C-alpha cells in the first residue's frame, strides 16, 4: 500500500532549524523562528500561565471530556476579546464559539464546516500569507486563490491592487483577512481601509474569515480588534479563527477558537450544530489544559492583569527591537531607508533582502532568515543587534 | 451562506446525559456513560497523573511547539506498549508514531493520510461498532462497509459470519479491528481467532487498521496486545490508532497516537512524511500536556508502577461489577442466562435488552442505557446493583 508514496516536500522550517543547530560558528543568529523570544533568547512560560497551572493542579478533580465546543467560559471570554464587552453580536446571541486545538485547528474546523455544509468552493488569501493557509483549505477540498497585498517597492499595503484582485472574487467566495500583525509582512489595513473592505465585502457577497493569531501584538487588545469589529458591524455572517499560542505563550498546548456568526440565534445555533459535527469527526473534543489556563486567566481580575502586562511587555519589546534595528542599520552604514520596519506590526517583517542575500547571510555570516527575507524581530536583542546589522550591511 | 443549513442529527449522548440530569427521581442510575467511574461514582484524576502534572509544573521552562509528531519519548513508549520491548518492528525501525489529539484524532489522521496518499476508498468496520467510526472515515471521503460480528442469540462472536462478510472486501481495502474490549460488545477474538484473521488478511490483501482505545482493560497490557502482535508478525504494513483517554483517565487532554508500519525504514519514513503533512494541515502539532504526562509516567519506573496498579484497579473493579451484575440478576429472579457478561471484556456490553425495554427502564425506573441496550458496567456499584437489577428483572 505504501511502497510508492511520494515523500512530502522537505519541511523548510526545521531544516532551517536543523541547519542553525549544526552551525558551529559563534555569533550565529536565528531570525527564522516562529515564536516570541525575550531579551535572553528564551520563550518562557508566562507567569500568569504558571499561576493558572498551579491552580488547576490544586483544583481539578476529573479529566472527564469537555463538550465538543470545549469550556463555556473560554468561549465567553473569547467572544468578549473579539467583539468587545456589550457587543450587539453577543447580546443578540449571534455568535457561537468552539474551543479548538490552536489557530490551525480553528482554520481546519472552519474549512471542513464550509466544505460540507455550504456552497463554498474557494478561499481568497493574501499574497503573501502564512504558507500553511493553502495546505489547510486544500485539505478540506477548497481551492485557494491569491489577492495582491504587498507593495515590494514601498514596503506598504498595495490597497489598489488588493481591491482590483478581489474583484475576481465571486459572491459566496470566502475572503481571509489577517486580523492584525499580518504574517509575514506586519502590514495591516488602517481602520478606514478596514471600513472600506467591510463595505466592499457586503456589496460583493464575500464571506469574511478572520484569522486572528496575534491579538495584542500590534497596538493593544481592543485596537487590534478594530478591523474585525468594523466587519462585524456590517455583516450578518462571518467566521473568526483565533489563536492564543503567541499572546499567552501557549504554543504547544494548542489553544484556539473557531467563532461562527450568523444573522440570528436560531440560524447560528443550527449552523453551529454542523460545526460541532465536523469537530466530532476530527478530534472529538478539544484539549483542556491550555484552554483551561486561558479561561482561568481571562475570568480572574488578578491573573488577567498580570497576563495583560506580560502581553504588553512582549508587544513593547518587539517595538523596541524594530526601532533598534532601524537605528543600528543606519549607524552601521546601510545608507538606505528601513523606516518601514517601525511602522509594521508584530513579530514579522519582510527585510527587503532577496533570496540570494538571505542565502549569503546564512552561508557567510551565520544569520538565518526565511528564503522570502521574512525576519522575526523577536529574534533580535540589544546584544545581537550590532553583529546582525553588520552582517546585513555587508550583503547590501 | 448559513440560512439553509440543516441541523446535525440530535446528539444521542448528551440528551441522554441531559435527560438523566433533569430526572428528579432518587435512585436514578446512568449506565449510558462513556467514561470509567470508580465505586463512588467519580472519574478522578489518577494519582500517577497528578504526580506527573506536579513534576511538569515544576520543571517545564517553555511551551514551545512540539514537532508535528509530538514528544519522541511518547512515541517510543507507545511503540513498546503496542509491539513489546525488543519487537522486530522496533529493532528494524519499521514503525513511526505521531502523537495525536486522542484516539479520534489518530483515526482521522489515519483516514486523511490514506485518502490523500493511497488508493484506499473503503474501510470495513464491525457491526456493531463505536458510531463515530463511520463519521471519521466518511469525513475523509472514505466509504464505510460493515462486517458481521455479533451473534445476538448466543451473545458471542459470530466468527463464521465475520469471515463470510469480509470475503466481500477487496485487496487494498482497509479492515478496522478493535484491539481489545470491543466497543460496544466487549467480545474479542481469541488468540487463535486473531491468528486466523492475520493469515486471512495477508492472503486477501487487506490493510489492517487497529483501533486500540482500551489497552489494559481486558486482561492486561501485554495480553491485550496479543491480537495486534499476531497481525504485526504477519504483515509488512498496518496502522494503529491508540488512545490513552480511558487507561490514563486523561479523556479531556486528548492523548492518542497514530502508528504507521511499513516493510522497512526507508518506506515508513517516506510514508510518514505524508502523515505529518496531513497533521500539519489539520491541527499543526499536538497538545503537550496530556502526552507529556503519559511519557513522564511510562518512562519512570516509580510512576509507571503506580499507574499500572491504578489501571489494574480499574480492570479489576470492572470484572467485579460484571460478576456482581450476573449474581444479582440471578438473586433478583431474572431466571435467564446472563453468564456472557462475565466473559466479555472492558466497560461495555450489550445487555440483551430491546430498544423498548431500554426505553421502559428509563421512563419507569430511571435506569439509563443507550438505545442499543449497551451498558457501561463501570456505572454499576455495590450500592446501586440491587435496585438496578430489580429494575431490569421488572422489564424482562
Ligand atoms: C496567520 C496565522 N494563522 C494561524 C496560525 C496558527 O496558529 P497555531 O500555532 O495556534 O495553530 C499562525 C501561527 N501562529 C499564523 O501566523
Ligand atoms: C473504539 C474506540 N475508538 C476510539 C475512541 C476515541 O477515543 P478518544 O476519546 O481518545 O478520542 C473510543 C472512545 N474511547 C472508542 O471506544
Ligand atoms: C507561529 C508559529 O509559526 C509561525 C510562522 O510564521 O510560521 C508563527
Ligand atoms: C469513551 C468515550 O465515549 C465512549 C463511547 O462508547 O461513546 C468511550
UniProtKB/TrEMBL annotation, chains A, B:
Species classification: Bacteria, Pseudomonadati, Pseudomonadota, Gammaproteobacteria, Enterobacterales
GO biological process, alphabetically ordered: L-phenylalanine biosynthetic process from chorismate via phenylpyruvate
PROSITE patterns named among the record's database cross-references: AA_TRANSFER_CLASS_1
Molecular-function GO terms, alphabetical: L-aspartate:2-oxoglutarate aminotransferase activity; L-tyrosine-2-oxoglutarate transaminase activity; protein homodimerization activity; pyridoxal phosphate binding
Subunit structure: Homodimer.
InterPro entries linked to this entry: Aminotransferase_I/II_large, Asp_trans, NHTrfase_class1_PyrdxlP-BS, PyrdxlP-dep_Trfase, PyrdxlP-dep_Trfase_major, PyrdxlP-dep_Trfase_small
Record-given protein name: Aminotransferase
Domain Aminotransferase class I/classII large, residue spans: 27-392
Family statement: Belongs to the class-I pyridoxal-phosphate-dependent aminotransferase family.
Organism (species): Escherichia coli O44:H18 (strain 042 / EAEC)
Encoding gene (name): aspC
Signal peptide: none
EC numbers, comma separated: 2.6.1.-
